[PDB]
């Protein structure tokens, strides 16, 4: 009769891996982490669009006032990256549970998403999360937007890792990625 037992495909704590076969430039060979996936649609941010200024760059920017001594004066030194399109003037720390900030969602036991100030002034501390990367913008898909664009030979998915995060260079996040999905480039 009718019992309708399915899949749901959420794809939260998912990567999202651009196919060598990507139309849109902008996604040409981007790796994205949904943050959020429902019914409403889904967010995400792109994990190896490193940008110009450094994390400590737009802390200065921002004049955020460290709430201890920066030794970790070369984390400070790293890159942050371009999240998404959307809303491109705000910011998301994409990081590693370490304490309690404001606004903060949890992902996982290593994965952890915070959109408050606060977490800026333990950035470069000793504070600071063990692991993090700074988002400026986020991508988004409408309702089932993003449901329709997997149909279609763009991306392909994986369950996260938080080292392909927050650790393996930015240079090789999407190509170990794909390299995890068995497959390479073209030619």
Known sequence: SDIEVGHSMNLTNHFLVAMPSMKDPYFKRSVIYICEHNQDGAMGLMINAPIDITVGGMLKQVDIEPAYPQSHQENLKKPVFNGGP???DRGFILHRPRDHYESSMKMTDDIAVTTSKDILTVLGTEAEPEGYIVALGYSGWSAGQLE??????????????????????????????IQKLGISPAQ
């Open 148 to 177: 329709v664009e997997l149909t279609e030979n763009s991306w392909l998915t994986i369950e996260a890792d938080p080292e392909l995060i927050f650790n393996t260079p930015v240079h090789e996040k999407w190509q170990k990625a």
């Open 86 to 88: 959307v809303s491109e």
